[PDB]
Design a protein around this ligand. Structure first.
Ligand SMILES: Nc1ncnc2c1ncn2[C@@H]1O[C@H](COP(=O)(O)OP(=O)(O)O)[C@@H](O)[C@H]1O
Ligand SMILES: [Mg+2]
Length: 158
């Protein structure tokens, strides 16, 4: 099954965390990485000013069940998601989201697939569009259509 996973990091210099996460994703059992999008930078989301986010999309071939995959991505968040900052470990700065899982629709206490808000997020849709321009959602919507309809700004590469 092809699973599409979003990676986000808001560390100030996130490349080493993101590469650690990618490696960890490639090491998930019963699975392998098919393709990785470019790394994209997106601003904040508040008045003051929070760090830029690095966003990317990964295509993962897997024979795990969806909730088994989530156990692994949450495990990677716990193992790689915090960076030591001087005398203490920082808060989680890595976010792994399952955006799509095959053509499956999932609604459990743990999993909402397709990702619950991805159609509102240029930072999720544009990296996916790079690696899957012809993608169709389980409800029949086409990825291209969502981007055409909302006209989300394109994001700069990191
Ligand atoms: N498709 C999914 N992928 C990952 N976690 C999901 C998904 N759908 C729902 N969740 C739930 O979201 C919670 C974490 O959300 P949050 O902290 O906002 O992180 P993120 O934006 O990375 O999902 C988890 O407890 C997890 O069970
Ligand atoms: Mg997450």
């Amino acid at each position: 099954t092809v699973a599409y996973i979003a990676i986000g990091s808001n560390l100030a210099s996130p490349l080493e965390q993101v590469n650690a996460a990618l490696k960890a994703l490639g090491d998930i059992p019963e699975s392998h990485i098919l393709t990785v999008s470019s790394f994209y930078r997106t601003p904040p989301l508040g008045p003051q000013d929070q760090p830029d986010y690095l966003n990317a999309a990964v295509a993962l071939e897997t024979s795990l069940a969806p909730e088994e995959l989530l156990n692994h991505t949450q495990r990677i968040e716990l193992q790689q998601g915090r960076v030591r900052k001087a005398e203490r470990w920082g808060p989680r700065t890595l976010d792994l989201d399952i955006m799509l899982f095959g053509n499956e629709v999932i609604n459990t206490e743990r999993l909402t697939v397709p990702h619950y808000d991805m159609k509102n997020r240029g930072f999720m849709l544009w990296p996916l569009f790079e690696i899957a321009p012809e993608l169709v959602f389980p409800d029949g919507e086409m990825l291209r259509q969502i981007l055409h309809t909302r006209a989300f700004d394109k994001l700069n590469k990191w």
